Point group: C5
Chain length 206, copies 5
């Protein structure tokens, strides 16, 4: 229950041990969701890394946002991957919002307030309710099995999550810095646990 | 009779079966026309696809707007094709308005509010009045014979059609979001029929 | 005596027969002149074409503005040519004003309101008073001998001509859409004769 | 005690002897610091050079900002180096602010008001209080041992230093020209000593 | 004693004979100076042109500004040269102001209101007072070159000269069109002599 406003978690060096665990008070299993966050790293040009890792006992990669070197954004839900190609990679903080809906399988990926085309993925599936949500490390087992070749080195912040799909207008205000209320993960009332070489400093992005 | 305002039809995956049929209450055969629409796809770089297919019992390709891979926009009326070359293809929603006039054969193609040069095509011809207008699939027979290699994968919306040629100023307000009244196909009073894997979601373009 | 305001002549297809003859009530032979016009074509990238052709019985190319493929603007007065190189060709309507002065031979070429350097050409010469001025075709004989490989395909409009040299400030208002009064060719009181496949439509440039 | 406002030190030619010594009234050893400055040189494309050299009797390179040819900014504190790669080098005045914190080892490097990612360097270390701070030359011994291959040729000015870490907002006003009060080195109340071919002229950057 | 305001000298063709001599009523020898001017030419072959040539009986190249496409700016004072090369080649009129100070040898070169780095050249030297100042051609007094000098082809104007070094703020107003008073060469009270194929026409730059 910490107001993480104007703050960001910063992982200064490549580790096997650093990560931040996010505690979500989930009761009902997810039939849709929207997760937005701000990250800033320099790895994009050399290796892949994990941005957001939502794992279940049954499925280690229930919902995962990853940057795969030389390709682009790799959005995977329920163990099934999908790609959002990004040819020219630029170094600057980046803000992403991604959403999925069981009813149609339509997944949207918004990078810096601008939408990528809509794709289909895991229609009819249903995301597990009890999960280990980790920032900065790649989960390969419920809350563990971290491969350092997929660790995040840089800053990450403003992570929020809704249990429904945000509309283009809402996704826009989130980007522009408008007022909103998440209902799963809330950066203004975040309940987390730090582990390793990770510090809390003022955010670099405005 | 549905107000499709702020909405778009979205074809999430490559199909042989998905399409949307538009019902136009046409009585008089067309001697000119203007059709404008907004589409957003990622196919441009790999294959060709059908944007707008107006077919008659006698002529399957009465009026057809198509993107032919590596070339550009392919505007065909009355079975006769014409090309609007587009070298550097970019991924972003795009808005096009195209018009034809029997009296001179002059066809204009406006991409994103800016006009391409005027070309001549099918002078003296006259477009059939009873037609099957389909979105997302390529007609090769009245209301059927769909080739999946020409299906549209992405969003399409704001389709409107006039039975006369819009002026540069009108075409401009349509683009900029001004008020106007179509007299053949009206996105604000659309009468359609969905078939297959196609959903109605909020438009991504502003 | 037609007010061609807000209009443009449009040559939709490659011809050997289409052109527009402009009638100028000239009495005194020219010792200087300024001719401005707006044109919009897509040929620039493939072939050369004639923009403005002023011919005399004695000299078929008394004053001629031409685009020679891969080089740039070719301004020729009195059979003698001069070049205004344009490396990167862009497709959009373009406005040009060009002027010549017998007294010094200084010829200016203004493209889109911005001046190219001053060059010398045909000093002391004197342009013939009785001439055939044609739009869209390349004259090789008084009022004839059209080579289709030099025809114009696109729109052309706002042609005006003065018997003196416009100053930078005047050339500027002409560009910006200010008020002025030509004294040879006047687009507001144009006296022309159409021949072939050429139509009069609303101008695409603002 | 000179108001160096609107002024810059200028080293016109490559020397072995030119430099400016800055006198800081330091009592407590540094546990953190922020140093900002403006420099403008043309060497970037041919050789490396010293921007800011803070030396102690025990450690000649206590805190040093250097540009290493073909690589980028080389920030070293306590003899330990770290790199901020800059691929495309541009010639224009540049403003940099850099900071370090013993408590975490986090070092920030801001170039022209925009932040580079955060890196870790010399955690737990503590910078010496009695030091020789030199501008324009590379120290390899307390107050001496200058290698001319690392001399600065150009202008340098607006150097300020704080004993704490400036926040993003503060670093921003410093850049934008807001009001602030340094507490180690103050360009408004600078106490220096010039040596060699160095002059004081009006700054070229705004 | 002519108000050359809003005018420019124009050399239409490559000559061996065309030039403009400027008469300066100098009494005291120069210990510093600032010379600004506007020129506009068509950066052609390796053959560059002389922009400003200030010659003495003793030294033919007392102060000379020379520009060649594939070289950049060559500023020479007292027979000794120095180079300022400008990267992006903009095809448009250009305005330069350059200054030198005997006391330090610092020479500044400002192109289009923006400063290039400060360099050292001819410290302690002193420019001759009785000189032949020529526009449009290099000046090598007592004859002796094997072949001609070959003149600038284009327009040149707004030449002014001060016997002291202009500050950044002054150099800025001169560029932006503010009011000032030269004290050696004054474009508002210019005393010149034309020779050859050179005309006085309205300036193309604003
Ligand atoms: Ca893993
Ligand atoms: Ca994994
Ligand atoms: Ca077909
Ligand atoms: Ca087909
Ligand atoms: Ca011909
Ligand atoms: Ca001819
Ligand atoms: Ca050294
Ligand atoms: Ca050293």
């Amino acid at each position: 229950q910490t107001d993480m406003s104007r703050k960001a978690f910063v992982f200064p060096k490549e580790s096997d041990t650093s990560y931040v665990s996010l505690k979500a008070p989930l009761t009902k299993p997810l039939k849709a969701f929207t997760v937005c966050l701000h990250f800033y790293t320099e790895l994009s040009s050399t290796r892949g890394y994990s941005i957001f890792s939502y794992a279940t006992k049954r499925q280690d990669n229930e919902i995962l946002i990853f940057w795969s070197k030389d390709i682009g954004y790799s959005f995977t839900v329920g163990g099934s991957e999908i790609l959002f190609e990004v040819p020219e990679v630029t170094v600057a903080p980046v803000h992403i919002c991604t959403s999925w809906e069981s009813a149609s399988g339509i997944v949207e990926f918004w990078v810096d307030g601008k939408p990528r085309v809509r794709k289909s993925l895991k229609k009819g599936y249903t995301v597990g309710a009890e999960a280990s949500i980790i920032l900065g490390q790649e989960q390969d087992s419920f809350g563990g099995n971290f491969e350092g070749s997929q660790s995040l080195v840089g800053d990450i912040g403003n992570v929020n999550m809704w249990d429904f799909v945000l509309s283009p207008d809402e996704i826009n205000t989130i980007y522009l810095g408008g007022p909103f209320s998440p209902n799963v993960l809330n950066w203004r009332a975040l309940k987390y646990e730090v582990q390793g070489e990770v510090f809390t400093k003022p955010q670099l992005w405005p």
